[PDB]
Design a protein around this ligand. Structure first.
Ligand SMILES: CC(C)CN(C[C@@H](O)[C@H](Cc1ccccc1)NC(=O)O[C@H]1CCOC1)S(=O)(=O)c1ccc(N)cc1
Lengths: 99, 99
């Protein structure tokens, strides 16, 4: 699809069998989800956002279906205003910015 | 242009007489630039995300040239770690996300 930016580019994702809304966020290097249970071991990761650097949990090779497309990659979990799909997974979708 | 997302989507802008680089960010509702002088009246605002919150000054109707295209809109200024072009200016470019 082609998504304009007059509203937030919120899409529906499926992760761990649950549908959730998430924001397609080209200013986010990584994908960060609100607290949820994910499989496997995690490791610590420090990420930078608008208010500073914060430690989150990093899970690897997590499948997510975004608009019906299946991606698999690193997902971080920690405090966040919303579920954020960053460039690590948008590149798997083939997403580009166009003007 | 069509900009892929393997790297951060950084472009050159010109604002308030100053040339700088900024991030095209579909996850940012409004443009926020690192602290600088802008003309005119402003209003205090708080913006929040992964760092927590930062206080900014909101300037209205500020002209910015982005990749040579002249656009106009609200510009927030404050201690952001990076210059961010948000949706409020990306729409004026006719910028879409496509996959
Ligand atoms: C978190 C989203 C919902 C909101 N932010 C936009 C995001 O793109 C934000 C932009 C950014 C890049 C690098 C350093 C600092 C900030 N990237 C971000 O945090 O990347 C993290 C999350 C995982 O990957 C790394 S914002 O900066 O808080 C924001 C809020 C309001 C306005 N008007 C403008 C900006």
């Amino acid at each position: 699809p082609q998504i304009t930016l007059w509203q937030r580019p919120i899409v529906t994702i499926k992760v761990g069998g649950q549908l959730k809304e998430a924001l397609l966020d080209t200013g986010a290097d990584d994908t960060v989800l609100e607290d949820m249970e994910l499989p496997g071991r995690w490791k610590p990761r420090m990420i930078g956002g608008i208010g500073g650097f914060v430690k989150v949990r990093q899970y690897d090779q997590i499948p997510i279906e975004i608009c019906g497309h299946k991606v698999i990659g690193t997902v971080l979990v920690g405090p966040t205003p919303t579920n954020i799909i960053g460039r690590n997974l948008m590149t798997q979708l083939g997403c580009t910015l166009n003007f």
